[PDB]
């Protein structure tokens with residue numbers, strides 16, 4: 816039993832809710848919140864900009880030190896950093912950005928990072944400003960992640976389409 820509430824169960828291990836991941840994170844304090852990161856951990860907009868704003872820019876300060884030490888992530892890769900006031904940990908995961916021409920096949924590799932964590936609060940990778948089809952992203956999530964994932968979908972309209980079209 817865990818503290819996530821109001822989710823629709825899609826599969827044995829995947830759950831979905833119309834929610835703001837920032838507000839969902841501040842209420843659950845999950846062990847892991849997933850950020851929709853880029854390779855530079857520049858949290859300017861989308862999910863990343865919202866998560867970072869909610870940390871009063873502490874996520875960005877920590878991220879800049881990470882990059883100065885380690886260099887950029889790989890597309891499809893991840894790193895574990897602090898969750899600040901939102902979660903114990905933040906798993907920064909880089910899905911491919913279609914608006915940069917990145918290979919959508921890397922979306923599966925991105926979701927594989929979730930399997931290193933027993934339970935996660937997450938957005939749909941490569942959705943939103945990353946330019947992928949959220950229905951495809953949901954399919955890859957369900958077919959790749961084996962750990963328990965609670966997906967927060969900000970837009971009520973897209974949420975309804977994702978549920979209604981789910982196979």
Ligand SMILES: CN(CCCC(=O)O)C(=O)c1ncnc2[nH]ccc12
Pocket residue numbers: 834835836837851860861862863865938939941942943944945946967968969970
């Ligand atoms: C709406 N999108 C896609 C567009 C932005 C992006 O591409 O990051 C989200 O990712 C998302 N999901 C869950 N809660 C969220 N709160 C703010 C954005 C957000």
